[PDB]
Structure formats: C-alpha cells, structure tokens
Amino acid sequence: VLSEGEWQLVLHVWAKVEADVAGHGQDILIRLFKSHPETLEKFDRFKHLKTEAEMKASEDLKKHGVTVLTALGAILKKKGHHEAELKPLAQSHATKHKIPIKYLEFYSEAIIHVLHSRHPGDFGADAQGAMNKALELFRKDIAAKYKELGYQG
Numbered sequence: 001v002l003s004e005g006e007w008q009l010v011l012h013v014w015a016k017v018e019a020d021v022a023g024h025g026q027d028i029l030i031r032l033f034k035s036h037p038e039t040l041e042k043f044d045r046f047k048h049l050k051t052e053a054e055m056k057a058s059e060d061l062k063k064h065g066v067t068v069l070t071a072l073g074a075i076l077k078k079k080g081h082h083e084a085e086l087k088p089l090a091q092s093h094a095t096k097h098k099i100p101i102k103y104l105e106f107y108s109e110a111i112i113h114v115l116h117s118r119h120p121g122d123f124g125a126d127a128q129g130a131m132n133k134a135l136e137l138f139r140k141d142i143a144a145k146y147k148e149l150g151y152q153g
Ligand code: HEM
Pocket: 039, 040, 042, 043, 044, 045, 064, 067, 068, 069, 071, 072, 088, 089, 092, 093, 097, 099, 103, 104, 107, 108
C-alpha cells in the first residue's frame, strides 16, 4: 500500500507529465523500444518504424502514447482504488495483445527513465521510490487480473 505522502509525490510528478502528455508518451515508447527491442514486435502498427526519427514523426505512435498515459494517469489518481480502470486494461493486455508482466516491468523502467530525464528536480530518490511503488502495485494487481482471465504471463 502506498502512504498518502507517496501518493502525493506520484501525483506531483504526474502533473508535470500532463504539461505535455504527447511528448512524454513518445519519449517513453521510444525508450522502451530502444532498451528492450523485443517489445516492438508486439505492436503490429509500429514495428515497421525503423529509426528514432521515424518514431518521433509518427502521428499514430504519438496518439497511442497519449491514450496509454491518459489511462495510466487515471489509474494513478485513484490511489490504489483502481479495479474499474484496471480491468479493461487487463482484459485487453492478457487476451488480445498478450503482454507478459516482464514487459510491463520494462515499460515501468521506461516511465521512470523519462520522468527522471525531464524532471530531475521533481523526481529525486523519494519521488522515484514512490512512483516505483505505484507502478509495482499496478503490476501486482494486473497480474492477479491476468490469472483470473486464465493468462499466466
Ligand atoms: C503501464 C503500462 C501500459 C499501459 C497503461 C497501457 C495502456 C494501453 C491502452 C490504454 C491501450 C488502448 C486500449 C487497449 O487496447 O487496452 C493499449 C493498447 C496496446 N498496448 Fe498497452 N499499455 C501498457 C503496456 C503495454 C506494453 C508493455 C505493451 C507491449 C510490450 C503494450 C502493448 C499494447 C498494444 C500492442 C496495444 C494495441 C495498440 C494499437 O495497435 O492500437 N502495452 N495499451
């Protein structure tokens, strides 16, 4: 469980994200594909993009990134009370996209890297600790939902 203080640190840095959701979304997706190239294989609509600049120029990748962060932001703002928001994401990610929890770990590492890169003064040790805990909670709870659906990834 996160404390109220941890939640507040999460939401404080999240507000910075919300100043430029698109740009954050692009940077996180790009970082994910650079750090863990196998994750790109899971995206039929993006895996033809061959360079960082093609990734940055893709409207579809940018639109997707905004969809992803909007969903994550809505989750985070529930401070752990996120069943209603998490369920549909679990459904799709288990049954259609087939995303293993290890790939969620990779995505979480990309989130932390971008936030630190763009907001180091508002993303020191305690903030990073808090966001890692929020993301860990998300991964824990999605995994349980995955299993309820019969998916063991
Ligand atoms: C914090 C982690 C993540 C969040 C919040 C998230 C969120 C979303 C949302 C909101 C959508 C659109 C609705 C849906 O299909 O459920 C989506 C689609 C998708 N997600 Fe994720 N996602 C996450 C992680 C991942 C990871 C790590 C991968 C792959 C390695 C992945 C692969 C996909 C794919 C392939 C789609 C369909 C994209 C399309 O063609 O339109 N997701 N995701």
